């Protein structure tokens, strides 16, 4: 259908905050021209992960109605969404980087991370590509992931639900406009989130194989 005036306001707010996304030229130049080693590659990944969290915190705080929620809840939502948001955000790097991806992919495959973890996540990046999601879709999807009622340790789940549902309605409308031909597009995006949820177990296993780590990463990931 067509977005309501309130819905239009919500999308722009999400769009403005999301498009503040940054990739320090410093991180970009490391992947392209840097010591190609398992140790060096792992370090680059950590820097990117740390950078994402800083971006993620800014996007999360700016989220409409996020400031309303309980302070414990805000941390709980932020802690809950970190792995899923990071993988989705990393997935979005088909549009953003072009040469670099081959280097980035190789560095990721040589990080010393086990092969089993690599296949599913890369499959996800390839799988996510099929959707050919717009930037607006990525922003709405990330916000929905962040604003999850289901997250552990939430004192007031219902309050989180109200914020999340408006996003879903907006995202659903976007699918029709962006992809009028496919009526199953909204369902497909939701399905990916289910595939996204898998990574927390996968991410948790990766953590267990010690390799480093940044102070910000440790708090969010509950390291030690």
């Amino acid at each position: 259908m067509e977005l309501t005036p309130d819905q239009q306001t919500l999308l722009h707010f999400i769009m403005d905050s999301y498009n503040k996304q940054r990739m320090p030229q410093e991180i970009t130049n490391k992947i392209l021209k840097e010591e190609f080693s398992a140790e060096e590659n792992f370090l680059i990944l950590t820097e990117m992960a740390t950078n994402h969290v800083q971006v993620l915190v800014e996007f999360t705080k700016k989220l409409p109605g996020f400031q309303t929620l309980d302070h414990e809840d805000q941390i709980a939502l932020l802690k809950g969404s970190a792995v899923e948001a990071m993988f989705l955000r990393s997935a979005e790097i088909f549009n953003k980087k072009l040469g670099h991806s081959d280097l980035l992919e190789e560095r990721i495959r040589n990080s010393g991370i086990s092969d089993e973890y690599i296949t599913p996540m890369f499959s996800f990046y390839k799988s996510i590509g099929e959707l050919k999601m717009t930037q607006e879709e990525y922003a709405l999807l990330t916000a929905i992931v962040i604003l999850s009622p289901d997250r552990q340790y939430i004192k007031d789940r219902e309050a989180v639900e109200k914020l999340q549902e408006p996003l879903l309605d907006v995202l659903q409308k976007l699918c029709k406009i962006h992809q009028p031909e496919n009526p199953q597009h909204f369902a497909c995006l939701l399905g990916r989130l289910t595939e996204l949820r898998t990574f927390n177990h996968h991410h948790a296993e990766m953590l267990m194989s010690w390799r480093k780590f940044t102070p910000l990463l440790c708090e969010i990931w509950d390291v030690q």
């Binding site: 800083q54 915190v57 999360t60 705080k61 302070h71 805000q74 941390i75 932020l78 802690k79 102070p215 910000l216 708090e219 969010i220």
Partner: peptide
């Protein structure tokens, strides 16, 4: 306290 860094970042600006 626990999660001081996250709270500080959240309460930023």
């Amino acid at each position: 306290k626990e999660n001081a860094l996250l709270r500080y970042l959240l309460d930023k600006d």
